[PDB]
């Protein structure tokens, strides 16, 4: 979804290194 | 569901880690 | 069932992450 | 079983960590 | 059997963490 | 046979948790 | 045999875990 | 998609390094 | 054999816990 | 793509670290 | 043989493992 | 051949646990 | 290609050292 | 390559170290 | 190769340990 | 090879020790 | 090889050490 | 072989302790 | 062998320690 | 055998608590 | 064994202690 | 056994914190 | 059983510490 | 059980962090 | 439970620390 | 749930330490 | 959320000092 | 996002500290 | 980013030092 | 990059301390 | 890189003996 | 490289000191 | 190599108490 | 080699005390 | 070796003392 | 050995304390 | 051995001390 | 074994002292 | 045992506060 | 144990402050 | 226990600092 | 508890230092 | 709580330095 | 929260510098 | 913040100097 | 900041001792 | 900086003697 | 850089003191 | 360098003290 | 270097008692 | 070396002092 | 050595004092 793109700009780190994990 | 986009803005950092694991 | 809904919004942390972890 | 309601309200973090594993 | 449900009520965590690993 | 009932009040931790994996 | 049932009251942890793993 | 790139100037150390493990 | 329950009273942990584990 | 060359030229050591374990 | 029954007596942890291992 | 049995008596302990493992 | 060789020249320890990990 | 025997006179320890890992 | 040997003579330990392990 | 004794007579402790871990 | 007795009697700690642990 | 035993009456602990582990 | 034994009665902690270890 | 006997009246602490660990 | 019972009055700390952790 | 509850009133602190971990 | 009840007002800081490790 | 809030009103320190940590 | 908010107004430091650790 | 933001203007230092810790 | 920059001015130094840890 | 740099320019010693560690 | 250099310039000791550790 | 050079020159000790670190 | 020499012959303690460390 | 020799004849204790932890 | 020894007559203390570190 | 009896000794108290650490 | 024996007449404290630390 | 003995009559004071840490 | 019953009756205080740490 | 309560009634302060650690 | 109520009452400080460090 | 109490009421200072140091 | 508020009105200063150490 | 606000009049300097220091 | 607040304006210098210790 | 600068205008010397110890 | 500015102004030494400390 | 440059000039000892501290 | 050059010159003792510490 | 050489005519004591402390 | 010759020479007691704990 | 034996015949005290410090 | 039974007839009474501490 | 015993008749008090601190 669009969900991950909100998860793009959280503010944490390991959140979007799990992103980035994901892409 | 639309539960996980209520995993999305918890305000946890492992909650939305493992949300950005599943997506 | 709806237990989930019940352990979403549970206080902990771990809980919540096993919870993503199965959505 | 109901059992498993009566294990969604025990109040241990590693309990309801497997109960979310198994809902 | 029953003898799970002895097991659903014992004081330990362990204990119940694999109750709730088999249910 | 009835062994596993007296695993079952064993006060013993590990071997309680074992019996819950076998039940 | 019978020598199981001796080992359910042996004092170790270990030995009664493994026991409870074969009943 | 896109996303990535902007992961590619996210200013943080740990969000880069799972980029380039996932380039 | 009988070795068994020679191995059964071997004052060791680890052998009597690979005893109950072949009986 | 070109990307991973923008993350050659990164100013960070575990971001180049991980861009040689990925080449 | 009865070479097993010499590492039945062996004051070996592991050796009187593997025997009970292979009996 | 016989060389086992000169392995029974081998003062090491992985090499009698070896042996114990193929008799 | 030949941002290795990039990477051989860059004056960061671990950055060399992954880099004759993977040469 | 001959990139390797560039990283063999090269004047840190953990590089050379991690060359005689890949030789 | 024969760079190995020149790592044979390297003045460092941590090398010559590392060459060591792979001989 | 013959580096190898090279390593037996070199006046460093961890290169020994690693031979011996190594022969 | 024989080498080994040579690291038998090497008047180092950690050398014998790691020498008993590969006989 | 018999070295082991030269290493039962090494005059160091460390080896002792190691020749005890491995016998 | 009866090696162990010698390591029974020998007066150090450490040594009788990995003794006890494996007995 | 009946030398961890011998290794129960062991004067020493950390002899018994070895001991004590494997029985 | 009984020995664990001599183990259980042995009037040291670490020994009861690790009597415990075995029960 | 019973002598779980012997440890439970030992009068040390040690003792019973190892019995607490092991119930 | 219950004997963690009487653990559970045991007048000392780290048994009761261990006894909320373990409920 | 409902020990765990008679640990909740514990006056001490130590026991009601590790209460936290379990809840 | 609800047992976590009469922890987080809690007095002590170390208290609402663990709590803030698991929410 | 909210009760991170009451640890959010909690007046202690180590209390919002780990509130940034976990957001 | 938002809180994360309600601790990034808060007027204390190991505050923003782990909000710098996880910015 | 661009909190980071309004923690670049914190007249704190470990806050910057900690963002150099984090970029 | 180019925030580095900035902390490259910082007139701190701490920080230029952690700036060193992340280049 | 280049800014490791710049901090090569940097008048102090544990910047140049930890740069050596780096290199 | 020729840094290193650099820092070989910078006339502090701290450099040069972190210097050596990594040669 | 020759420069741990320049090292070698360093007039530091400290610098001597870690060229000896290194040869 | 031969450093060693010339570290070996090194006048000072600290030097050849590290020499008989790593011999 | 042969140098650890020429500081065996060597008129001073701490390296014969490193020379007793490492035999 | 045997020097171990010239320094158990080394007429220093501190040697004799390292020497009964490694016997 | 027996030269602990000859360590256990050493008129010096830490010298026996070391040997009493040893046995 | 009974040396530490030698040392029980040793007139030292720290000797006697190190004994009642290891009884 | 009962040569502690010979320790228990030694005449000085930190042999008793030590007693009590070890009980 | 009961030895440590004869160490309850003895008329020392520093014993007692041991005894009451370990109940 | 009750000997807690009767060190609660010990009229000295040292004492009673190990006694809620320990509770 | 209640024994703590019996602490907490002794008259001492060290006692009641212990006190609100463990509150 | 309540007893923190008991020692927060304690009319004592030391005591309520501590409680500043535990809240 | 709001007890902080009245250890902000205790007359006493060390209770409201260590309130500025934790805010 | 805002107590700090109440501390801020303490007229107390090691007030104000815990206060710039935390800012 | 800015407060602290205020304490560079502040008119005295021990504060100043801890400011200098934090900068 | 620029305030160290104020904290450059200011016309005490300690300011400017602990500045040259933090450069 | 510059900064630490200007304190370089700075006719105080213990100013320049910080400065030597950090050069 | 060459300001330590500035530092090495001082006329003071305590600067070259510590400057002979840095070389 | 050789500026600690030139502080080998200087006219200072405390200078060439320093220099001697440096050599 | 030799100046430590121009610091062995250096007229002053503290000197040589630091040279005999270092040798 | 020989230098120090050159300090060992040093007419100073400090000299050999610290000879003495060191042999 | 032997100059100990030379600095055993040593004229003076704080010679032999020191010697009798190191025997």
Do not use: F, G, K
């Not at 979804?1 to 959140?15: F, I, M, N, Q």
Request: charged share 45%; proline share 9%; aromatic share 0%.
């Amino acid at each position: 979804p669009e969900a991950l793109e909100r998860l793009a700009a959280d503010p944490d780190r390991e959140v979007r290194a799990a992103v980035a994990r994901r892409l």
